Amino acid sequence: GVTIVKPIVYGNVARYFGKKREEDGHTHQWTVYVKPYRNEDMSAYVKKIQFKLHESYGNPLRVVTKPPYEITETGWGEFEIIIKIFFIDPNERPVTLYHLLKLFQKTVVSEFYDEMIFQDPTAMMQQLLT
Ligand SMILES: CC(=O)Nc1ccc2c(c1)CCCC2=O
């Protein structure tokens, strides 16, 4: 058969404001992201990437259809974000990733390697993947 592996990295970077913002008490900017391990445009084969935030964010289900696949925000607390990658091929199962936002103990980075495996995809999707 044919196996196409698309290595990815996902997670988040964060920077402390310097002080706490008295307006809303946010302390950090963060960017949560998926990206290919090596430089490529994933919109070749990816329809969209949802980033599900804590539901006390406005518009908690964020959608990104064009690289970079990232959401930038501010806050004061760490919680799980769900990252769901949908493919242009409707017969390819979405990939669900789970990421604990890291804010605390210099840029803070929490990023994970993973691999989207396409086992025997349609020739058409194979064309999109390569
Ligand atoms: C509207 C708004 O700013 N919501 C918001 C902001 C920050 C945070 C949360 C929600 C909940 C999780 C922790 C956190 O840092």
From Swiss-Prot:
Stated consequence of mutating residue 76 to A: Impaired binding to histone H3 diacetylated at 'Lys-14' and 'Lys-27' (H3K14ac and H3K27ac), and subsequent deposition of histone H2AZ1/H2A.Z into specific chromatin regions
Keyword Ubl conjugation: yes
Span of the signal peptide: none
One MF annotation (Gene Ontology) recorded for this entry: histone binding
GO cellular component labels: NuA4 histone acetyltransferase complex; nuclear matrix; nuclear membrane; nucleoplasm; nucleosome; nucleus
UniProt keyword terms in alphabetical order: Chromatin regulator, Coiled coil, Growth regulation, Isopeptide bond, Nucleus, Transcription, Transcription regulation, Ubl conjugation
Region (Diacetylated histone H3 binding): 76-80
Oligomer status and interactors: Component of numerous complexes with chromatin remodeling and histone acetyltransferase activity. Component of the NuA4 histone acetyltransferase complex which contains the catalytic subunit KAT5/TIP60 and the subunits EP400, TRRAP/PAF400, BRD8/SMAP, EPC1, DMAP1/DNMAP1, RUVBL1/TIP49, RUVBL2, ING3, actin, ACTL6A/BAF53A, MORF4L1/MRG15, MORF4L2/MRGX, MRGBP, YEATS4/GAS41, VPS72/YL1 and MEAF6. The NuA4 complex interacts with MYC and the adenovirus E1A protein.
Name listed for the protein in its UniProt record: YEATS domain-containing protein 4
Species name: Homo sapiens
Full-sequence range covered: 18 to 156 of 227
